[PDB]
Amino acid sequence: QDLPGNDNSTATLCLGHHAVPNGTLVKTITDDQIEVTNATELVQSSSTGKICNNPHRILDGIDCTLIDALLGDPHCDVFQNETWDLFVERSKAFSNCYPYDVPDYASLRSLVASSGTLEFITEGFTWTGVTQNGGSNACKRGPGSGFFSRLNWLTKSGSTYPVLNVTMPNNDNFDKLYIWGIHHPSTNQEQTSLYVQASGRVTVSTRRSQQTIIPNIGSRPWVRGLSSRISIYWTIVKPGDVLVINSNGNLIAPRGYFKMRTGKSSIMRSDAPIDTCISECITPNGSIPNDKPFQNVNKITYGACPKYVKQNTLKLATGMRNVPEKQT
Amino acid sequence: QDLPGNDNSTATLCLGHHAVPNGTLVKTITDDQIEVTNATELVQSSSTGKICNNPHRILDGIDCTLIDALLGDPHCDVFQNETWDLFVERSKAFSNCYPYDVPDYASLRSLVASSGTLEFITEGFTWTGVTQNGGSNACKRGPGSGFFSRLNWLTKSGSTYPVLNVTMPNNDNFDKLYIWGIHHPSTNQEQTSLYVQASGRVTVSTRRSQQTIIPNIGSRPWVRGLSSRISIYWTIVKPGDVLVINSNGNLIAPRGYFKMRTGKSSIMRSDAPIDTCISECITPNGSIPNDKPFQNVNKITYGACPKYVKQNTLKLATGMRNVPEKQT
Amino acid sequence: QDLPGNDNSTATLCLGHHAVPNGTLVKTITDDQIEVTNATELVQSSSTGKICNNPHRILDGIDCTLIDALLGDPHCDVFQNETWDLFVERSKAFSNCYPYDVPDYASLRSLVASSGTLEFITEGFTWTGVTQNGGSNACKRGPGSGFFSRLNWLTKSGSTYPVLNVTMPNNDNFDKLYIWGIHHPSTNQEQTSLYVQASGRVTVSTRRSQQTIIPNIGSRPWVRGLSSRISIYWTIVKPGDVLVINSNGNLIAPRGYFKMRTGKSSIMRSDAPIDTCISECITPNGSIPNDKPFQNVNKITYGACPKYVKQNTLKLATGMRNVPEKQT
Amino acid sequence: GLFGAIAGFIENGWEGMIDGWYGFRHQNSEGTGQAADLKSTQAAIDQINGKLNRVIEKTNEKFHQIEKEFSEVEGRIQDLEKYVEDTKIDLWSYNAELLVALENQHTIDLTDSEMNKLFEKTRRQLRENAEEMGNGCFKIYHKCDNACIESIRNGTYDHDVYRDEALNNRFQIKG
Amino acid sequence: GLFGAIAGFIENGWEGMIDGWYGFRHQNSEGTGQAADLKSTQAAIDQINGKLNRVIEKTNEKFHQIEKEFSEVEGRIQDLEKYVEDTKIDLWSYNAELLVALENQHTIDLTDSEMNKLFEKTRRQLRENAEEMGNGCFKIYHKCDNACIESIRNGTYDHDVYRDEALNNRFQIKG
Amino acid sequence: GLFGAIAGFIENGWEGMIDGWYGFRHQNSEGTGQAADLKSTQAAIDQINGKLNRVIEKTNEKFHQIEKEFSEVEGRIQDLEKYVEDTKIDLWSYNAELLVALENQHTIDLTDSEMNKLFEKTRRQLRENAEEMGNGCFKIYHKCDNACIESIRNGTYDHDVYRDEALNNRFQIKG
Numbered sequence A, B, C: 001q002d003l004p005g006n007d008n009s010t011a012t013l014c015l016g017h018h019a020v021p022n023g024t025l026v027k028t029i030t031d032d033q034i035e036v037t038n039a040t041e042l043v044q045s046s047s048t049g050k051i052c053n054n055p056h057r058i059l060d061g062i063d064c065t066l067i068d069a070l071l072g073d074p075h076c077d078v079f080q081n082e083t084w085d086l087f088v089e090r091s092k093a094f095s096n097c098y099p100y101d102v103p104d105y106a107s108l109r110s111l112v113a114s115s116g117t118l119e120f121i122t123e124g125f126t127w128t129g130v131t132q133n134g135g136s137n138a139c140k141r142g143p144g145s146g147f148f149s150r151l152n153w154l155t156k157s158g159s160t161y162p163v164l165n166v167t168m169p170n171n172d173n174f175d176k177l178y179i180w181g182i183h184h185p186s187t188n189q190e191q192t193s194l195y196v197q198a199s200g201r202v203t204v205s206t207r208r209s210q211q212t213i214i215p216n217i218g219s220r221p222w223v224r225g226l227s228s229r230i231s232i233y234w235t236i237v238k239p240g241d242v243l244v245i246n247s248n249g250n251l252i253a254p255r256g257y258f259k260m261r262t263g264k265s266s267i268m269r270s271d272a273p274i275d276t277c278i279s280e281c282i283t284p285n286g287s288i289p290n291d292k293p294f295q296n297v298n299k300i301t302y303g304a305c306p307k308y309v310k311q312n313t314l315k316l317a318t319g320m321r322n323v324p325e326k327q328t
Numbered sequence D, E, F: 001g002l003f004g005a006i007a008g009f010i011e012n013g014w015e016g017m018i019d020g021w022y023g024f025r026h027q028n029s030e031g032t033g034q035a036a037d038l039k040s041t042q043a044a045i046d047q048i049n050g051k052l053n054r055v056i057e058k059t060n061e062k063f064h065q066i067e068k069e070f071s072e073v074e075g076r077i078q079d080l081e082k083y084v085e086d087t088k089i090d091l092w093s094y095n096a097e098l099l100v101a102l103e104n105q106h107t108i109d110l111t112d113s114e115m116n117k118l119f120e121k122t123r124r125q126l127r128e129n130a131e132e133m134g135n136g137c138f139k140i141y142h143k144c145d146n147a148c149i150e151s152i153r154n155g156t157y158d159h160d161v162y163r164d165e166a167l168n169n170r171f172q173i174k175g
């Protein structure tokens, strides 16, 4: 080997691991605060405060709700034929035309909201024997009286309101949404003055369905000078089907159809400011980053967003246990 | 160092762990019966059999359902202005006044059940031209005829039933629940005898909504001497809104409003005895202790309760594997 | 002690484990492709393509939907008193009798679908003063006119339609389902021709409930020569209760009751072929084997089936890590 | 379990050890003895209580919910009310079943671990003076009276004090 | 994995071992050989089958449920019918993904464990007569013919029989 | 944690080690020195990143859903809309809570494991030339200069080169 290898000394080698002065407490199966070298937060808990206007198409409703934009309240005429990925409804929105109510408001707002388009096609309905284009002073269009842009208020011509019986075929290859309505007068006098018959009736049908609504006379609360109301209804007509509108008084007739589509559109109630930035996840509190897996900003989301969770902090250990060598 | 240790012997040291004669079988990722030293049960599977009357406010409905207590069936007059955290409805409950039906009974029972109060405020409705306070012998109040305490049956005065058109503003800062109804006569004769007009109509509305119900004449099955029915409806009036009740016959008028609140109240169907004890978790089978995480007593609970699970036993090992030394 | 005698040498012993040339990648907590010796698939992703006709009782609806089989469209008379564990409805089904609509079609299809029986009992209703057994040429039974086998169209006798007021007690110990309906005429002339009264009315009730429907006159779209429609309704009568049918015009009367039961029956829309084989899990795509825990064939299932999952493959490692000699 | 001490190289437990979960039995110059080890018993117990308390942490409370029992047949809406609850129950049942399975699996490897850690600790301490008989017992190659056994147990044993005695006894012999 | 035997101190597997999952390879003065170890192979296999059967334990059965495909647009009630199912599917998908991840992770540490337990067992048995070469091979410092190799494998090896031979060979030499 | 190296037989960490997570400090002929071990640091880091990326893998996206805030009181249907969401939130919250608990538990045993694997690897390599002082330090019984320390660290140390020197120093002495 060598010869008498005599140098009898020794050495010491010690294995160890790092430790940090600071350190973060995390939960475990067996402990709920154990300190580790480092951790990362898995709950997103803060919004920017603004709804980024990119990548989704945000449509700010300003002071129109979606249904008033749909019906064509004069003040919402800005929205005709408009489209959106997300329609934001503001708390300040107001209606300002003939007082109306929508029996299943919630389904009509939904059904339009996810169709994502207000594209309207006017069709040539011929109403013989009635006066078209009725309006009201509660729905001022400019200086004059007016009514919803997408609806057509029929009243008597001379001394008679005939039985209207019209039909409109769906010859296209898409579904057609028709919004129509009925006028509920305040007085039997109002009824006969406008529609002659003392009891109106509206029946709208297809090969598949039918709705017959009869009006209801009575005073409701004064809203914009009126005690009458109109109630809104809808009928979808499938390709190849046919719409038949049959009435004897009180019909608020459709002027054509909204076309329906299938997409990722929805509606959101938010007063957050829209701003220019790209963000995939929208919350009524403004956009939030979807880098973390869970979020605690709001349970309402649109887009690629973290899963809402009750916790506001969940730290994932990304290091060993911290066992400090003093602590400085 | 030390001197001649004449004897040089050895020793034996053995490490080991305990074992118990008994032992409990638990499930594992890889085994489904492995025996451990000790375990603890995580499924609560037995009730006391009694609903403890503490800490929640239990209201025993005795032989009244919540809706009859609401309407004011004579026999439920005990409950006027009553309140609860949990209203217990008993299987023995019975109605015993004018036969009625509630179109969406399930929402009215819910809506009242979580409001948690039957506080009624009478308001000064003035019904001019009709006879108030109608009652029936099927709703005996004491020796006499009677009707629901919270409703007011209007019939003609002399030879006329006018068009009633009344209004009641919500000037307070809370929502008001109004329960009202309509009488469906058995015969056209009954209709004209009571309400003169051969076809009644009730329209109740606010700035936001309206309901017009028209009665339906026809014989139903004899219930407490009657073939007529009254159907119950409800209208909530928000602060600042206004109620307008407009009718021409068959109205069963409200006497005022129930006030609504927001709380932790609910309703439960149970025949369990109420008893004095404190227990947080209530099950229709009686209270159960919420010390364990899961329970298998009933999927209906109220209060701080374990999560209902299909399993009836789940043992958590609280000790090592049992490896005993004798045979079996 | 042991005496070596002569040899002086050493040996080498090495422990190791197997490895396979092939190997399967699986996901881990820390890796998402790590290669193991063997794995097993937990997602079932393929159907046989056929609905096995065993063990469940499959009833192929051929060109009848469940509701037409229920009502008794002539062409569905094959199904009278039929029963099923799973009724399969085919996309090709068609109706071919008097045009009708069912207000809550979805609940009636459900309610019948899980009752699982079309057992019909005829009861002796006596309709005095009206003509029974009306039929139509749009519902041809054989060469002649006809109508739904389970319904009875009443029209006037001579010059009068009386007020019908009939009753049928539930004296048995089971619930009775009664399907009845109302005829909506196209013209006021049709109304008076058939039912004399210019406004019909149908009220069907029990001790617990009532429905009063009034018809609606108006033209709907021509369907099999007709613009009239009949709407279908249902009433369940509990043991000890009583049905009272009261009408003044337009009633399409029940001929008796369907009996209801409680079972594991359901309905499925599928064009898959029924075939002879035993399979517990049925999917609208055909049966699938329930040996794996999760499946990705279809979210609609009937029977003992794997839990539907978005993933189409999930491999469970059934061997150690593959660390081969050469490569992989 | 994962370390193969319990129900592994240690053939079986001692039903007689009543004063702790892990411990020692010896035979030395002065006779035989048994003694529980309290540090590893407390380590094992504290971890299992930690685990236990986390599982019994907060039953959340719920007040008005949906109806879960119905007396009439209603169709579409009642079908959904039933389906929401049935899918909620199966999900919570899956959760409970998986939770105790993971938990229990871990409790057996945790306790297997503490046994093996106690063994390794004692090994390290005896240094060159003892040999592992492979059944969880060490053969100590030097005269070790009761106070010596106590110093190994309470962790103050000085291997140097007996190293030449032990090394002589253990190696030299006649080979 | 956690023990660092497989794909750890044992460099790689033997594609040639076809008769078991874990085993031995030796080189002595009589020859070379290979032999599977059947006890650790059965231990590993039984645990993975245990795990496997628990996962394939009972598909629960469901009959009438809610509609999951619709042909008309209806609004509020159909939105909820769709939302109930979509949130049920994502929750069951999360469950499946997490389940195989935990499971697979554990199967790799379990098999790593059995490899290391076999190693430790063999170490313990050879006592002072062999040294660990550190790659999962022991150097046995005494003449060990094939019956000797068989006794190590079948667990009957007596270290005392060769202790003076081995201790001489292993230590003495010239230092 | 499960292996009892970190916060176990290794008393505490070195706040001074800034160049890696695991490593060596030596004291020898030329003095004292410290060095991070980069292979075990990378092994630990890679596993924690693997774990990390799996958790941040795909936020799924959702568009039109159901209403989750209501302004009027409606009864039965709104009760169900609320109940579907509240039970969805509690289930996702349970999931998040359990996920970080399992994950964190495993990250502590994984890093405990890598520390212990580094120790075992170094033990194996020094063979008969060093003894374990039991606190994670080896006493090397032969003259080992800085290049010698570097060959242990970079894994090229030849035990044979110092075996007679070490065996003499370690055993012979006077017992």
Ligand SMILES: *[C@@H]1O[C@H](CO)[C@@H](O[C@@H]2O[C@H](CO)[C@@H](O[C@@H]3O[C@H](CO)[C@@H](O)[C@H](O)[C@@H]3O)[C@H](O)[C@H]2NC(C)=O)[C@H](O)[C@H]1NC(C)=O
Pocket: A187, A219, A220, A221, A222, A227, B165, B166, B167, B242, B244
């Ligand atoms: C039926 O009863 C209701 C309630 O009493 C009557 O409604 C009230 O009718 C008056 C007269 O039209 C309304 O007055 C107007 O109020 C506005 C705002 O204050 C004011 O600008 C006008 O000068 C006028 O005073 C009153 O607001 C209205 N109130 C409600 C709650 O609707 C209704 O007229 C009665 N109808 C019949 C036919 O008897």
Ligand SMILES: *[C@@H]1O[C@H](CO)[C@@H](O[C@@H]2O[C@H](CO)[C@@H](O[C@@H]3O[C@H](CO)[C@@H](O)[C@H](O)[C@@H]3O)[C@H](O)[C@H]2NC(C)=O)[C@H](O)[C@H]1NC(C)=O
Pocket: B187, B219, B220, B221, B222, B227, C165, C166, C167, C242, C244
């Ligand atoms: C329409 O048809 C129904 C059913 O046939 C008639 O109902 C029945 O009417 C009679 C006479 O009022 C009821 O008699 C009562 O029986 C009880 C005992 O149950 C007895 O205490 C009373 O003094 C009286 O005799 C009978 O119960 C009732 N049955 C049902 C099921 O309602 C109804 O009267 C008919 N209406 C007209 C206007 O034709």
Ligand SMILES: *[C@@H]1O[C@H](CO)[C@@H](O[C@@H]2O[C@H](CO)[C@@H](O[C@@H]3O[C@H](CO)[C@@H](O)[C@H](O)[C@@H]3O)[C@H](O)[C@H]2NC(C)=O)[C@H](O)[C@H]1NC(C)=O
Pocket: A165, A166, A167, A242, A244, C219, C220, C221, C222, C227
């Ligand atoms: C109310 O208006 C509707 C729509 O204009 C009218 O419906 C149409 O009525 C005609 C005459 O009955 C139907 O014609 C028939 O069609 C069949 C199939 O082509 C054919 O066999 C007959 O020879 C005849 O042409 C037409 O199909 C029908 N169209 C629709 C969409 O229903 C209805 O008649 C009007 N009613 C009244 C009372 O004015």
Ligand SMILES: CO[C@]1(C(=O)O)C[C@H](O)[C@@H](NC(C)=O)[C@H]([C@H](O)[C@H](O)CN)O1
Pocket: A133, A134, A135, A136, A137, A138, A145, A153, A155, A190, A194, A226, A228
């Ligand atoms: C009060 O005067 C007005 C109005 O609203 O301004 C004038 C308007 O030209 C007239 N429109 C038609 C088509 O008749 C209406 C309606 O008669 C009422 O609104 C019925 N409630 O009344």
Ligand SMILES: CO[C@]1(C(=O)O)C[C@H](O)[C@@H](NC(C)=O)[C@H]([C@H](O)[C@H](O)CN)O1
Pocket: B133, B134, B135, B136, B137, B138, B145, B153, B155, B190, B194, B226, B228
């Ligand atoms: C049968 O006699 C009574 C009754 O019920 O006791 C007498 C009672 O004073 C009378 N009440 C009024 C206000 O008219 C009622 C109703 O006329 C009927 O119930 C209508 N179905 O009838």
Ligand SMILES: CO[C@]1(C(=O)O)C[C@H](O)[C@@H](NC(C)=O)[C@H]([C@H](O)[C@H](O)CN)O1
Pocket: C133, C134, C135, C136, C137, C138, C145, C153, C155, C190, C194, C226, C228
């Ligand atoms: C058109 O002729 C028929 C028909 O349908 O074949 C003749 C048939 O005997 C007759 N049935 C009865 C009971 O009246 C019906 C109905 O009058 C109409 O369908 C009312 N829409 O009309």
Ligand SMILES: *[C@@H]1O[C@H](CO)[C@@H](O)[C@H](O)[C@H]1NC(C)=O
Pocket: A038, A039, A040, A318, F052
């Ligand atoms: C803590 O962990 C996160 C995620 O691994 C990482 O980005 C961060 O740099 C870590 N902190 C340090 C000081 O290493």
Ligand SMILES: *[C@@H]1O[C@H](CO)[C@@H](O)[C@H](O)[C@H]1NC(C)=O
Pocket: A080, A081, A119, A120, A121
């Ligand atoms: C809306 O779009 C349709 C389809 O191109 C068009 O014909 C119509 O005139 C448009 N109207 C408005 C107001 O943009």
Ligand SMILES: *[C@@H]1O[C@H](CO)[C@@H](O)[C@H](O)[C@H]1NC(C)=O
Pocket: A045, A046, A047, A284, A285, A296, A297, A298
């Ligand atoms: C988000 O918005 C809701 C309702 O607007 C509010 O209660 C919540 O605290 C907000 N959270 C954050 C992070 O802004």
Ligand SMILES: *[C@@H]1O[C@H](CO)[C@@H](O)[C@H](O)[C@H]1NC(C)=O
Pocket: B038, B039, B040, B318, D052
């Ligand atoms: C079994 O475990 C439970 C929970 O840890 C404990 O209360 C009980 O005392 C244990 N049993 C024994 C005998 O230690």
Ligand SMILES: *[C@@H]1O[C@H](CO)[C@@H](O)[C@H](O)[C@H]1NC(C)=O
Pocket: B080, B081, B119, B120, B121
């Ligand atoms: C119910 O409470 C209200 C409010 O204080 C009170 O005015 C009313 O008279 C009470 N009625 C009864 C019967 O207690």
Ligand SMILES: *[C@@H]1O[C@H](CO)[C@@H](O)[C@H](O)[C@H]1NC(C)=O
Pocket: B045, B046, B047, B284, B285, B296, B297, B298
């Ligand atoms: C609880 O009550 C339900 C219904 O009353 C019953 O089926 C169930 O078995 C009961 N369970 C217990 C533990 O009482």
Ligand SMILES: *[C@@H]1O[C@H](CO)[C@@H](O)[C@H](O)[C@H]1NC(C)=O
Pocket: C038, C039, C040, C318, E052
């Ligand atoms: C792979 O694993 C499955 C399930 O354990 C088993 O059936 C199959 O035989 C295994 N493959 C081999 C080659 O062992």
Ligand SMILES: *[C@@H]1O[C@H](CO)[C@@H](O)[C@H](O)[C@H]1NC(C)=O
Pocket: C080, C081, C119, C120, C121
């Ligand atoms: C249906 O079954 C009932 C009950 O046995 C029987 O009376 C009836 O006549 C049957 N009808 C047919 C068409 O099978």
Ligand SMILES: *[C@@H]1O[C@H](CO)[C@@H](O)[C@H](O)[C@H]1NC(C)=O
Pocket: C045, C046, C047, C284, C285, C296, C297, C298
């Ligand atoms: C099953 O059927 C659905 C709808 O029919 C289809 O989209 C899906 O891809 C099919 N899957 C298989 C495995 O057949």
Ligand SMILES: *[C@@H]1O[C@H](CO)[C@@H](O)[C@H](O)[C@H]1NC(C)=O
Pocket: D147, D148, D150, D151, D154, D155, D156
């Ligand atoms: C350990 O044991 C020895 C003998 O009993 C005793 O002198 C010593 O002080 C003990 N040390 C401790 C810390 O118990």
